[PDB]
């Protein structure tokens, strides 16, 4: 295997990994550890927007809000997140919105599986084709 047996939090090559105490293999999926939320792949906290058991959270780079560490979910309220070329909108509960949304008078569609805005072309949603701008805003009309 790629890793030897470790348990709990360990530092490897400049990153903190979490290994399951009962199996000594890297953690996978969402976990709250000491009141900090992470989304793991093979022990390594992932950085980005991922779906946890109460919706999409922003698992942020270190020092984004309240001195969070790499991959720790952060408070992120009532604003857009423009990450890696993709567009999200976060509500008052610090979760990314999904489906049809009206924001500042404009209509968006946030993909249910990724929370990313449909953007930059024609998208088929529930049998109907719509046009979305590069900014994720739905144009007038049917296509």
């Amino acid at each position, epitope marked *: 295997h790629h890793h030897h047996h470790h348990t709990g939090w360990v530092t490897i090559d400049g990153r903190r990994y979490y290994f399951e105490p009962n199996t000594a293999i890297g953690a996978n999926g969402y976990k709250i550890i000491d009141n900090k939320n992470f989304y793991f792949r093979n022990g390594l906290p992932q950085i980005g927007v991922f779906k946890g058991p109460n919706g999409f959270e922003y698992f942020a*780079p270190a*020092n984004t809000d309240a001195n969070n560490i790499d991959g720790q979910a952060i408070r992120y309220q009532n604003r*857009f997140l*423009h*990450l*890696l070329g993709n567009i999200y909108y976060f509500g008052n509960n610090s979760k990314a919105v999904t489906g049809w949304q009206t924001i*500042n008078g404009n209509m968006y569609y946030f993909m249910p599986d990724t929370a990313m805005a449909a953007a930059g072309g024609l998208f088929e949603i529930d049998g109907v084709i719509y046009f979305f701008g590069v900014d994720g805003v739905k144009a007038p009309g049917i296509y």
Partner: nanobody
Amino acid sequence: QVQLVESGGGLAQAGGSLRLSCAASGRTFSMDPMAWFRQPPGKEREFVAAGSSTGRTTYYADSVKGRFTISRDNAKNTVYLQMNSLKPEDTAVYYCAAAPYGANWYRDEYAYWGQGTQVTVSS
């Protein structure tokens, strides 16, 4: 703890060139768009340029299109503004910015702002 620091400003003659650098520290910006804004005397802050996380996709104010070029080096956590064919109209305090939280990158809503560097162009 996070700082954006502009350098490369100052005086220049019309038709000439300047290169601004904005060095970021305290947090990695490789996932965020980065931008330049400017504030002319008496007027409000205005959009100049913005570049995507990798640097592949760029947007420019109509005023500066063709003359100004935005680029970035993520290994250095730095964004640049190459200012060619300078005009007296370009005279302004220039600000670098990162991580927009408004609807689009043109809007003056960014999570991090530089201190600003004075640029003066003479006729």
